[PDB]
From a paper:
Thus, we changed our approach and determined the structure of the ligand-free and G protein-free apo state of [name], to capture its inactive conformation. Given that [name] exhibits high basal activity, and forms a complex with the G protein in the absence of an agonist, we engineered a [name]-BRIL construct, in which ICL3 was replaced with the thermostabilized apocytochrome b562 protein (BRIL) to stabilize the receptor in an inactive conformation. Then, [name]-BRIL was purified in complex with anti-BRIL Fab and an anti-Fab nanobody. The structure of this complex was determined using cryo-EM at a local resolution of 3.6 Å in the transmembrane domain (TMD). Our apo [name] structure represents the first inactive state of this receptor, serving as a valuable reference for understanding the conformational changes associated with [name] activation. In both the apo and intermediate states, H8 adopts a reversed orientation toward the cytoplasmic center of the TMD, a feature previously observed in antagonist-bound inactive structures of C5aR1. Notably, in these inactive conformations, helix 8 (H8) of [name] is oriented toward the cytoplasmic center of the transmembrane domain (TMD) in a reverse orientation compared with conventional H8 positioning in GPCRs. This unique H8 conformation is stabilized by a hydrophobic interaction network involving residues on H8 and TMs 1, 2, and 7. The ionic lock formed between R3.50 and D/E6.30, a structural feature observed in some class A GPCRs, has been proposed to stabilize the inactive state. However, in [name], at these positions, R1203.50 and Q3726.30 are present, which do not interact with each other, as observed in our apo structure.
Numbering used by the authors: 22 to 85, 89 to 160, 331 to 365, 1001 to 1049, 1060 to 1118, 370 to 439, 449 to 459
């Protein structure tokens, strides 16, 4: 099945250089450097460095043609890019979970300088794990070390961080839904009261409005202060209308209830818009990260599976022949991950709108 590996690798290169170059150039010399975009820039740079080495592997597979370098360094680029990508992805997930975490580690030193320092640290940490591959049974230990460091622990970290993030996103949702329900009963009762004659239905509608307003003010920092002050004014106005309707005046209660609309729009509408806006975006920002992580892991799993199988299985076996036959396909797919990654940005994203907005 060597021809299948050949064709898939050639297709990966043919569609890998253009996309990587386009994304790198658009994200690099268009907008300003921020703590968020820098990580994706580093990830795409590592993927581009990985993609640059494909023709050497193609020549090695096709000819099996000068020097030791064919068997010396170009096999190490896969390990290097895998490790750098894993560490950068776990750093992105850690930061995404940190944003919603305690503010003590949010405003301490969160700056572009810290971002590039941590990126350099990540590159160095990925580098110190590259030496064992290049230099030099060892196969017993090095395969286990790569699997444990590159696959298990970071995947656990991303799973925990994203489970906490989705649990926190599932919570606020309901809270908003409750506030929207209270808003809807307030609005429809205020619509009922205008067309309702008699002094009894006015009191019945105002009782419901008062309960809804109290519940809405209960649901939840000058922002909060202003939000609660608006509802205090709302409840006071409801009381004015209630005490007008109690003494058998209908039109005055109608006007008093009409006065509620001004305060409602002036106070609570802006908070409603902010709550709806913030919840919607964070959804997409988390969506892209989760999809990227899932694609990365599903691309890299066959390689680890075949490594474990080769380590466990004794040689001089036809099953060994099958596994070394399919090793080319496994490595080819692992490398095709690099070409796959840039396309999901446009899938889940004017060039600026489809690329730059995808990170923020």
């Amino acid at each position: 099945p060597v021809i299948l590996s050949m064709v898939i690798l050639s297709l990966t290169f043919l569609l890998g250089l253009p996309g990587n170059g386009l994304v790198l150039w658009v994200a690099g010399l268009k907008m300003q450097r921020t703590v968020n975009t820098i990580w994706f820039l580093h990830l795409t740079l590592a993927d581009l460095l990985c993609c640059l080495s494909l023709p050497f592997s193609l020549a090695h597979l096709a000819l099996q043609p000068y020097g030791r370098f064919l068997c010396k360094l170009i096999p190490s680029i896969i390990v290097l890019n895998m490790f750098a990508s894993v560490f950068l992805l776990t750093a992105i997930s850690l930061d995404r979970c940190l944003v919603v975490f305690k503010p003590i580690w949010c405003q301490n030193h969160r700056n572009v300088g810290m971002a590039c320092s941590i990126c350099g640290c990540i590159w160095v940490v990925a580098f110190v794990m590259c030496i064992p591959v290049f230099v030099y049974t060892p196969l017993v230990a090095i395969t286990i070390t790569r699997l444990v460091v590159g696959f298990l622990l970071p995947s656990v970290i991303m799973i925990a961080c994203y489970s906490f993030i989705v649990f926190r996103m599932q919570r606020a949702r309901r809270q908003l839904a409750d506030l929207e329900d209270n808003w809807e009963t307030l609005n429809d009762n205020l619509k009922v009261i205008e067309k309702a004659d008699n002094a009894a239905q006015v009191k019945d509608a105002l009782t419901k409005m008062r309960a809804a307003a109290l519940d809405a003010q209960k649901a939840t920092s000058p922002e909060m202060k202003d939000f609660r002050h608006g509802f205090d004014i709302l409840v006071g106005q409801i009381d004015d209308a209630l005490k007008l309707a109690n003494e058998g005046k209908v039109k005055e209660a109608q006007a008093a209830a009409e006065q509620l609309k001004t305060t409602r729009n002036a106070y609570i509408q802006k908070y409603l818009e902010r709550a709806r806006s913030t919840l919607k975006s964070q959804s997409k920002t988390f969506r892209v990260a989760v999809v990227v992580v899932a694609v990365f892991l599903v691309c890299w799993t066959p390689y680890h599976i075949f490594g474990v199988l080769s380590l466990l299985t004794d040689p001089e076996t036809p099953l060994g022949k099958t596994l070394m036959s399919w090793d080319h396909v496994c490595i080819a797919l692992a490398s095709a991950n690099s070409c796959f990654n840039p396309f999901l940005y446009a899938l889940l994203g004017s060039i600026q709108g489809i690329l730059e907005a995808a990170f923020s």
